[PDB]
Structure 1
């Protein structure tokens, strides 16, 4: 077989142009007339569709073209006689390929909406999750549009009387929109907490209050 695709980093396998490295420009139907723009070369040369191979230098980018490791990407890290080893970008999976084979959320879990919008999932839908954010607004977000956030079960904050409060603590709300309510701290930050009250039917009892609006019950 012999197939060439534009944009690949190739080399010259024979002739006076041997070892020259360049990037493919175009491709044709049968006589590909592949033309590689060599590095630091203003001119463009002509090669047959069998004289060029996909070579890569140490520290460059590569993406498998065919075979068992198709779809993996990374950076070659060694050049043996012919085998080229690299490590996958997405994971640490080892990858050994030829140079020619390369080219050039549960109900009530804290989620990240944005750096400053660590929301809590309050409703599961087929494609989206309702998320009560720290400001008291409910937003709808796609399942893949949010990341699961590591809960800090040992967080500590100050309440309205500068008492230490912790996750799982029962507090009363003495200010703000939820003044008068009582709840269990589910997720705690220095300035606000996500609370639970079973008597509160809205959002399944999940509400949010500033920590300075709380007092330990």
Structure 2
């Protein structure tokens, strides 16, 4: 039947007219109403307009099927948001594809398929599709539904239909929610190769054997042969590093080679071992770690301090983390183990203010007896802003008397240090 519907010049003649985008539907409705009114009013003399339509994907334009351009110009004259001058003739060969329905981007829904709801952004599984192809049943994660919590909280709205079927606020099965949604709402040996896809993505190596589409390559990172599909390899033309990992409650290691799921780490004992991502309990924050040790000379050493070994190669490097009995030091002059080595602290050498926030009065100065508010203390000196003067002055705290938030008695710097920090009684 469609073979006989091919458009022809003498049968099909559609002109495209530019219009303000987005107003396609409203403009089409208005034009149709105007055509009906003209037909009802004029009578026998009717404008030769066969159809007026538009395409959603083609915004800013409408299409009118008329035998002559003048008819379209007269019909569209005086219609706002339509540029009659900006019009073009649609060639016959282009007419079919213009009316061809657009291929919906939604893939054919199948039972068990995974989709995204347009629970916005939550993965869903297609369980059943209605016979009318208008609604689809989707299984989603509500966290999994907990019957115990529902019973404890809102037992009034909770019902049990089966051993694994619960209804809450009008259907949960196996801890997942089933809900109905509208469809519209849903190589040669020795060649250098690199993994672009797969579990070993990012790995690089040298091919050794190829057979039945499977390429085996020796990888420098692992120093072992790995066989991967050819399509997943690309021929290349020839936790992060230094992070601290708590292997166990008493084991701390430093990473020397940070991979995707495989990490090479040197432990406090200096042994270097390869482990998986799951073997790491958590990452220790060096900046937030308040750990300090004592060197041979007795000078305190903290994270980041540069130290030099007294014995051995006298390696110089910055301390990354401090262990109870060992210290990890990274050196830029050493390439072995990424420049990270574990050394004993004894074998290396390095290269709460009560006044704050309380009103005070000065005793021995040029501003004695003047109320002031303490801002900060730099050590042995307290910075105070005067109430009557827009200036901050540094004065020794010992010669200042503290007062209560609201009046109260004056106390020197001998009770707060001795007695528990508390404002006096008004």
Structure 1: give runs of 5+ residues left out of the alignment.
1-65, 85-95
Structure 2: give runs of 5+ residues left out of the alignment.
1-138, 160-165, 176-238, 352-426
Residue of structure 2 equivalent to 1:98: 168
Quick check: 1:111–1:121 contact (8 Å CA) kept in 2? yes
Give the CA deviation at 1:135: 0.7
Matches within 5 A, 1:199-210: 199-210=333-344
Matches within 5 A, 1:81-92: 81-83=156-158
Residue of structure 1 equivalent to 2:153: 78
Runs of 4+ in 1 over 4 A off after TM superposition: 72-75
Give the CA deviation at 1:194: 0.8
Quick check: 1:112–1:148 contact (8 Å CA) kept in 2? yes
Quick check: 1:179–1:213 contact (8 Å CA) kept in 2? no
Quick check: 1:110–1:120 contact (8 Å CA) kept in 2? yes
**Does residue 214 of the first structure (1) align with residue 348 of the second (2)?**
yes
Q: 1:209 to 1:70 in 2, by over 3 A?
A: closer
**Does residue 140 of the first structure (1) align with residue 215 of the second (2)?**
no
Residue of structure 2 equivalent to 1:110: 244
TM-score (norm. length: structure 2): 0.29
Quick check: 1:161–1:215 contact (8 Å CA) kept in 2? yes
Give the CA deviation at 1:74: 8.4
The structure with the greater share of residues assigned to helix is 2
SS of the residue corresponding to residue 337 of structure 2 reads: helix
Question: What is the alpha-carbon distance in structure 1 between the residues aligned to residue 313 and residue 282 of structure 2?
Answer: 30
SS of the residue corresponding to residue 81 of structure 1 reads: helix
SS of the residue corresponding to residue 285 of structure 2 reads: coil
Of 312, 321, 326, 1:187 maps to 321
Quick check: 1:191–1:212 contact (8 Å CA) kept in 2? no
Question: What is the alpha-carbon distance in structure 2 between the residues aligned to residue 158 and residue 75 of structure 1?
Answer: 54
Question: What is the alpha-carbon distance in structure 2 between the residues aligned to residue 200 and residue 155 of structure 1?
Answer: 25
Of 117, 133, 142, 1:69 maps to 142
Count residues with an aligned counterpart. Answer: 139
Of 285, 290, 303, 1:167 maps to 303
Give the CA deviation at 1:211: 1.2
* Larger CA deviation: 164-173 vs 118-127: 118-127
Give the CA deviation at 1:71: 3.8
**Does residue 196 of the first structure (1) align with residue 271 of the second (2)?**
no
The structure, 1 or 2, with the larger RCO (C-alpha pairs under 8 Å, 6+ apart) is 1
TM-score (norm. length: structure 1): 0.54
Question: What is the alpha-carbon distance in structure 1 between the residues aligned to residue 147 and residue 322 of structure 2?
Answer: 39
